[PDB]
Amino acid sequence: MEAAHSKSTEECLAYFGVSETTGLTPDQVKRHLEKYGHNELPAEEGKSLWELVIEQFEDLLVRILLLAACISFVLAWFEEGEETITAFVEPFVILLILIANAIVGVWQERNAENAIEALKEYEPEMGKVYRADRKSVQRIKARDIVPGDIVEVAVGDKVPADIRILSIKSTTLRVDQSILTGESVSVIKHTEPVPDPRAVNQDKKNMLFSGTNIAAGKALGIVATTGVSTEIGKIRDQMAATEQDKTPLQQKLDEFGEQLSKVISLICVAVWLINHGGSWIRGAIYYFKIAVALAVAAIPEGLPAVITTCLALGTRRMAKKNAIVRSLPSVETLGCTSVICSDKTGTLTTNQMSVCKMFIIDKVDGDFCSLNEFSITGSTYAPEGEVLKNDKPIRSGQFDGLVELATICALCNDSSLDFNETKGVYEKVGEATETALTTLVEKMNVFNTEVRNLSKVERANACNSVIRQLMKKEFTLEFSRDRKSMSVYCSPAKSSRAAVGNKMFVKGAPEGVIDRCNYVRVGTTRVPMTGPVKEKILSVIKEWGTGRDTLRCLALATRDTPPKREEMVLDDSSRFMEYETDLTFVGVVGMLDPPRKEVMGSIQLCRDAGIRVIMITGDNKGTAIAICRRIGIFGENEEVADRAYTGREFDDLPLAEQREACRRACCFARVEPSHKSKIVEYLQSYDEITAMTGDGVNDAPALKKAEIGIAMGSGTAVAKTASEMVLADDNFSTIVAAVEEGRAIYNNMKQFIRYLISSNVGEVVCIFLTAALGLPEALIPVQLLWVNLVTDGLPATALGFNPPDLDIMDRPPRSPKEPLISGWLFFRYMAIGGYVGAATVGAAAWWFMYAEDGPGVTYHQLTHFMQCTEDHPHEIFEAPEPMTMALSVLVTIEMCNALNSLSENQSLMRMPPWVNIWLLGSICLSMSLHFLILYVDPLPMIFKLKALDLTQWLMVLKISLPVIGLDEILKFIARNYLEG
Ligand SMILES: Nc1ncnc2c1ncn2[C@@H]1O[C@H](COP(=O)(O)OP(=O)(O)O)[C@@H](O)[C@H]1O
Ligand SMILES: CC(=O)C1=C(O)N2[C@H](C1=O)[C@H]1c3c[nH]c4cccc(c34)C[C@H]1C2(C)C
Ligand SMILES: [Mg+2]
């Protein structure tokens, strides 16, 4: 049953043909369970680190490296004999690596818990129903409860399903829908039908939401809906249907993979395009060495390990700045953040609400309507502060009107203060807005109660108490979005001066309350409310709220002559506004919820960063805007008409203009959680990367949709699980900082990503020469693997600690359509790639040509024959020394190219190699490995190498170093004829 809240208590039984006294017949429980299914959320879809591993190997490149491992096998020989121990490394090193590379995409690439699985921590196990086949309250497995059957909930219970309340047996009933909202304070319930068929949950006050807890009382009701069709069940169904897109990195790395696998099979047919006795088998085998060589030459097998290292090093780095980044990759996307929608309370502001202005009527004579208005001092909840009129401390109790102001402030209040012994400071107890009222009536001290001889704890609620002595609070009428007010019934006590009438003390939002006052209290007298009076009262409320004060105002009125105690139906919340009528305006208090000292700047920082900030709120559109200026969302005087909207305004627009309003929008007032999703959606229909804050399962669906969901340290459990980042301190600037860090982590990433790739293009062009010109392969797999995993590995990682630009936040957000290699940068790495493909080929065969200790046969047609079937023009071709000439050339150029990476366009002149202290330190450790694998004998025998002579080390530095020169030329040109 969908619109239960709106049907009568009798209409709900009539719909399920059930008796409140008896309950569901055991037959009905059968038909129903068949019609509506079980009261559960769909079971997990399932995962596992075996099919997760198998999901890595289907990728194109990890299919090629695995193909090369198949060929590395079909090249050696057959099944067992004896030993030439040495051999099977090339096929075992790759398969070793692949397992250790797939695995790194899991147990440090968290892909486990989802906010949808979290929603199985608020669906209960047991629930108490009254069916026909007993007489007692049979407690059953929640999973078997069904739409229609009667249910019992009592204090402490988790509500099992969505339930239209039938009768409240206890005095009152108090639910705790914190899970949904997040606002600790419980809510009163009733049984009258909420007649509006499309009422929001906040207005469904005769309903219990499966997942919620009864925080007091005890009631019975009929199950309206279960399983996926409850309100919490429907949030689950929204997050279920969310297509989670990959990051801008994971996406252009994916089309890099496709381009790389396509280029390999393009060269493996291009080598073919350029290409006595025996048989057909050695010919086939040959081309299969260069294919495998080409395989390892273009794949940067290091990348993953390097990336992960940077990400895991960034996580710990943002955690120090209070930003808890959960999803690993989120650190790169954190850099492209285009827009930020934040909540106001608690993020932009400090939720330390305090009163600091207030007024009552002074005198009214015809048109004369004068106001008597004071100011209060003190930001904290501490009773420490003073009241000043005309900017000069006055004694609050000397003004009759101020007495009433504080009377209502204390009696129409459901909160309090408490002194904390540990922290040594006061604590709020209840609602921040109300507690501020409680602190006010203290500061005021309208009766001059001795309060300086009390102690911290005793004085906190001192004056309040003295006032709770004067009047007795019988019952009270809860606030409701509907009438926007609340009131308490009060009666006299001891030798006072009240009689013939009790009093209702109303306290709500200004517009509402005032429109319900026919009388004004001027002192202790009273006079009829008039236009000129009302217009004053409003004029100032508007001033304070939409001023540079940005105050939230409360009207305070009393019903002097209230209805008889036996005249109000206290269980009909709809009639609460009627009882709150014929009121008398007493005065207005206005309070502040200060914006974080930090945020002002943080906001400016986003201005220069080119990132948009949207503020969601609860303040009225007027004060919503007024806070926006004061934090700098808008200029102090500029236009904003079509820039800020309210809940209903935005709903009154058709989709086209809603979508439109979203790229120019900056502020939303009085919104439903339902909008946050619509807004995220819209923002994306503009290819905008969106950071979005929220808490409560209510906002879980939007924290999933937003590229960056953000929760709060103090936030609800589920809300966190829904987000990708959590502010451990709740600060708005904690977002801003993380976005800059993400900006710096990606900038440094773009570098080492191109570095490790730069090598691969050179490694290939090298093996393309040793095949196109038919020489002996200057470099083999097992060597390259070491270079790409370790040799370039340490420098590439150390390139992640580069100093970030000083204008890093002074440039607009980087697009997701930005390619990491494009323009002049393509020609700069096809030169560097076309230079290494020659330098590793030059200096190596140079050992076959111009060498001293090696067989120097200049132009000995190494191209003509590597068959030696003839031996007419004349195993040293399989010598270790020449391979050691190519390898040492690579390794050294790499370390040079590492230095050529520290910046994109700054000369090594302008950008000194000794800025990145950890890039130098890495090169040092990179070379001490190149030497290690040459004279710790097991190694150079395995790599097929042998230590070069001191004359064989200078040739390298003659043919290597000149790259730093070729590079600089490209830097100062893209600097001076490619700018404008
Ligand atoms: N959709 C709405 N319609 C009317 N009043 C609302 C609505 N949403 C919120 N409010 C009121 O505005 C107040 C301020 O809300 P906000 O500034 O977002 O902080 P919070 O929502 O955490 O209270 C809320 O306490 C609530 O009383
Ligand atoms: C088995 C396993 O998990 C994996 C791997 O073993 N890898 C990556 C990979 O995902 C490969 C890869 C996919 N896409 C790209 C782009 C650029 C570079 C690489 C890759 C390297 C590949 C490798 C071998 C590191
Ligand atoms: Mg909030």
DSSP string, 143-167: GG--TT-EEEEETTPBP-SEEEEEE
C-alpha 258/C-alpha 60 separation (Å) is 7
C-alpha 161/C-alpha 209 separation (Å) is 7
Q: What angle do CA 425, 426, 432 make, to 5 degrees?
A: 135
**Nearest Cα residue to 440 out of 489, 476, 396, 485:** 396
Q: Which residue has the tokens 């096929």?
A: 91
Nearest ligand to the CA atom of 109:
2
C-alpha 231/C-alpha 250 separation (Å) is 35
Q: Using CB atoms within 10 A of its CB, is residue 375 exposed (0-12), middle (13-18) or buried (19+)?
A: middle
Residues in contact with ligand 1 (CB, 6 Å cut-off): 344-345, 481, 617-619, 647, 670, 672
C-alpha 286/C-alpha 294 separation (Å) is 13
Cβ-contact 791, 840 below 8 angstroms: no
C-alpha 647/C-alpha 644 separation (Å) is 10
Segments in 773-863 forming alpha helices (H): 781-786, 793-798, 824-849
**Nearest Cα residue to 962 out of 906, 897, 905, 913:** 897
Number of H helices, E strands in the chain: 37, 27
Q: Using CB atoms within 10 A of its CB, is residue 308 exposed (0-12), middle (13-18) or buried (19+)?
A: middle
- Give residue 978 CA to ligand 3 midpoint distance, Å: 49
Q: Does residue 391 have a known ligand-binding role?
A: no
Token pair recorded at residue 634: 């808008």
- Give residue 96 CA to ligand 2 midpoint distance, Å: 13
Q: Using CB atoms within 10 A of its CB, is residue 867 exposed (0-12), middle (13-18) or buried (19+)?
A: exposed
Q: Does residue 299 have a known ligand-binding role?
A: yes
Q: Which numbered atom of ligand 1 lies nearest the CA of 200?
A: 1
Segments in 501-559 forming alpha helices (H): 510-515, 531-546
Secondary structure class of 212 (helix, strand, coil): strand
For atom 23 of ligand 2, the residue with the nearest CA is 301
Rg of the chain over Cα atoms, rounded to whole angstroms, equals 38
Q: What's the topology of domain 55-112+241-337+738-980?
A: Calcium-transporting ATPase, transmembrane domain (1.20.1110)
Q: Which residue has the tokens 């040079």?
A: 896
For atom 12 of ligand 1, the residue with the nearest CA is 618
> Is residue 301 within 6 Å of ligand 2 at its C-beta?
yes
Q: Does residue 608 have a known ligand-binding role?
A: no
In CATH, 12-54+113-240 is 3.40.50.1360 = no
Q: Which numbered atom of ligand 1 lies nearest the CA of 345?
A: 19
Q: Which numbered atom of ligand 2 lies nearest the CA of 98?
A: 6
C-alpha 159/C-alpha 681 separation (Å) is 32
Cβ-contact 573, 205 below 8 angstroms: yes
144 counts as catalytic: no
Q: Which numbered atom of ligand 2 lies nearest the CA of 103?
A: 3
Mutation choice for ligand 2 from 299, 308, 756, CB with most ligand atoms inside 8 A: 299
C-alpha 531/C-alpha 700 separation (Å) is 47
C-alpha 124/C-alpha 230 separation (Å) is 14
Beta partners for 293?
A: none
- Give residue 301 CA to ligand 2 midpoint distance, Å: 6
Answer left, alpha or beta for residue 774, where phi above 0 means left and psi between -120 and 50 means alpha: left
C-alpha 546/C-alpha 544 separation (Å) is 6
Q: What's the topology of domain 351-594?
A: Calcium-transporting ATPase, cytoplasmic domain N (3.40.1110)
Cβ-contact 615, 628 below 8 angstroms: yes
Instruction: Write the CA distances from 885 to 36, 191, 327, 959, integer angstroms.
Output: 76, 88, 44, 11
Sign of the four-CA dihedral 771, 772, 775, 777: negative
Q: Does residue 434 have a known ligand-binding role?
A: yes
> Is residue 101 within 6 Å of ligand 2 at its C-beta?
yes
**Nearest Cα residue to 335 out of 311, 368, 351:** 311
Q: Which part of the chain is CATH 2.70.150.10?
A: 12-54+113-240
For atom 16 of ligand 1, the residue with the nearest CA is 618
- Give residue 341 CA to ligand 1 midpoint distance, Å: 16
Q: What's the topology of domain 338-350+595-737?
A: Rossmann fold (3.40.50)
- Give residue 482 CA to ligand 3 midpoint distance, Å: 20
Q: With DSSP H G I counted as helix, E B as strand and the rest as coil, what are the percentages for the chain, rounded to 5?
A: 45, 15, 40
Q: At what angle do helices 599-608 and 732-772 cross, to 10 degrees?
A: 30
Report phi then psi at 622, rounded to 5. -55, -70
For atom 26 of ligand 1, the residue with the nearest CA is 618
Q: Which residue has the tokens 């904690």?
A: 734
Q: Does residue 285 have a known ligand-binding role?
A: no
C-alpha 261/C-alpha 270 separation (Å) is 14
Q: What is the DSSP letter of 363?
A: E
- Give residue 356 CA to ligand 1 midpoint distance, Å: 21
Q: Does residue 464 have a known ligand-binding role?
A: no
Q: What is the DSSP letter of 656?
A: H
Residue type, 799: L
Q: Which numbered atom of ligand 1 lies nearest the CA of 619?
A: 17
> Which strand (E) or helix (H) includes residue 376?
strand 368-376
**Nearest Cα residue to 518 out of 533, 529, 530, 507:** 529
**Nearest Cα residue to 148 out of 42, 233, 22:** 22
Token pair recorded at residue 175: 């639910």
For atom 21 of ligand 1, the residue with the nearest CA is 618
Instruction: Write the CA distances from 195 to 7, 35, 580, 842, integer angstroms.
Output: 7, 27, 21, 87
Q: Which part of the chain is CATH 3.40.1110.10?
A: 351-594
Mutation choice for ligand 1 from 670, 693, 699, 730, CB with most ligand atoms inside 8 A: 670
Q: Which residue has the tokens 């590439």?
A: 796
Secondary structure class of 586 (helix, strand, coil): strand
What residues are neighbours of ligand 3 (ion), with CB under 5 Å? 343
Token pair recorded at residue 366: 């015809």
Q: Does residue 894 have a known ligand-binding role?
A: yes
Q: Which part of the chain is CATH 1.20.1110.10?
A: 55-112+241-337+738-980
Nearest ligand to the CA atom of 64:
2
Residue type, 721: T
C-alpha 709/C-alpha 951 separation (Å) is 60
For atom 15 of ligand 2, the residue with the nearest CA is 257
Q: Which numbered atom of ligand 1 lies nearest the CA of 671?
A: 1
Cβ-contact 743, 809 below 8 angstroms: yes
Beta partners for 217?
A: 173
Secondary structure class of 904 (helix, strand, coil): coil
Q: Does residue 481 have a known ligand-binding role?
A: yes
For atom 25 of ligand 1, the residue with the nearest CA is 618
> Is residue 257 within 6 Å of ligand 2 at its C-beta?
yes
Nearest ligand to the CA atom of 69:
2
C-alpha 555/C-alpha 583 separation (Å) is 11
Q: Which numbered atom of ligand 2 lies nearest the CA of 65?
A: 24
Cβ-contact 848, 882 below 8 angstroms: yes
> Is residue 56 within 6 Å of ligand 2 at its C-beta?
yes
Cβ-contact 741, 255 below 8 angstroms: no
Resolution at which this structure was determined, Å: 3.4
For atom 22 of ligand 1, the residue with the nearest CA is 345
First-last CA distance in the chain: 66
Q: Across 226-367, where does the E strand assignment appear?
A: 323-325, 339-343, 354-365
Instruction: Write the CA distances from 581 to 53, 449, 507, 584, 907, integer angstroms.
Output: 69, 33, 12, 9, 78
- Give residue 183 CA to ligand 3 midpoint distance, Å: 8
Q: Across 430-560, where does the E strand assignment appear?
A: 471-477, 487-492, 503-508, 517-520, 527-528, 552-559
Q: What is the DSSP letter of 201?
A: G
Residue type, 927: M
- Give residue 676 CA to ligand 1 midpoint distance, Å: 14
Q: What angle do CA 261, 267, 268 make, to 5 degrees?
A: 85
Sign of the four-CA dihedral 720, 723, 724, 729: negative
Largest pairwise CA distance in the chain: 133
Segments in 565-699 forming alpha helices (H): 576-579, 599-608, 621-631, 647-651, 655-664, 673-684
Beta partners for 388?
A: 375, 393
C-alpha 503/C-alpha 654 separation (Å) is 47
Method: X-ray
Q: Does residue 213 have a known ligand-binding role?
A: no
Beta-carbon contacts of 850 under 8 Å, excluding residues fewer than 6 positions away, are 856, 858
Q: Which part of the chain is CATH 3.40.50.1000?
A: 338-350+595-737
- Give residue 342 CA to ligand 3 midpoint distance, Å: 9
> Is residue 253 within 6 Å of ligand 2 at its C-beta?
yes
Which of 157, 162, 343, 699 is the catalytic position?
Answer: 343
